[PDB]
Amino acid sequence: EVETFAFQAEIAQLMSLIINTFYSNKEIFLRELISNSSDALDKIRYESLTDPSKLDSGKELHINLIPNKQDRTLTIVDTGIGMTKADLINNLGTIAKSGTKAFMEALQAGADISMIGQFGVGFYSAYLVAEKVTVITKHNDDEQYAWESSAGGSFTVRTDTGEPMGRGTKVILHLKEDQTEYLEERRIKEIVKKHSQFIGYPITLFVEK
Ligand SMILES: O=C(NO)[C@]12CCC[C@H](CCC1)C2
């Protein structure tokens, strides 16, 4: 049972800007997704300070980076707070309408695309490098869901049948054919050292057979 939704017009506009603007500095997508993972880990940590049972779904707070050259996918996994179904539908838990407005007024004032994360819509930078993005998420108060979009104005949401997650979010980037550099170990390491070197959670870069 798959539900198909239209993006709000402003978010479709944001996505088509990201996909169609000539902008060579695409590597910042990974900084932005790791930053969102760190924000999600901070949230479940804060809730656990007054209610330790919030970690019954998983005590370890970490980020995994999983490249898969056979599938041409880069997956960013975190064990943060996750998202409910309602969060997923409501622009993956972001204030994306007003964030997109503020971003586009910043661009008019001399900002560039790399500042997207300052406006709360850094998730959508995934579309710098991915043709399709799948988000699998589990929040303590809801069931496990899969969101998916290849842009083009719509996204889908379905109950996830896959491997149970416990709690957190998995972003699966189905990379564009010309963006496979982001599956190479040395390139990922370079980007994490350049842009994410002070993130307060362990990051494990998986290797491949
Ligand atoms: O966990 C990390 N830092 O806390 C690493 C350090 C370098 C090599 C791996 C990939 C980049 C982050 C792991």
Author numbering: 16 to 224
What does the published report state?
Heat-shock protein 90 (HSP90) is a highly active molecular chaperone that plays a crucial role in cellular function. This ATP-binding site is essential for the ATPase activity of HSP90, which is necessary for its functional cycle and for binding client proteins.
In this paper, high-diffraction-resolution crystals of the N-terminal domain of human HSP90α were employed in crystallographic fragment screening to discover binding fragments and binding sites. A diverse library of 800 structurally distinct fragments was screened, yielding 91 starting points for the fragment-based drug design of new HSP90α N-terminal inhibitors. They remained stable after soaking for 6 h in crystallization droplets with added compounds at a final concentration of 25 mM. A total of 948 data sets covering 768 compounds were obtained, of which 738 were utilized in PanDDA analysis to identify hit compounds. One HSP90N monomer was identified in the asymmetric unit. Electron density was observed for residues 6–310, with only five residues missing at the N-terminus and one residue missing at the C-terminus.
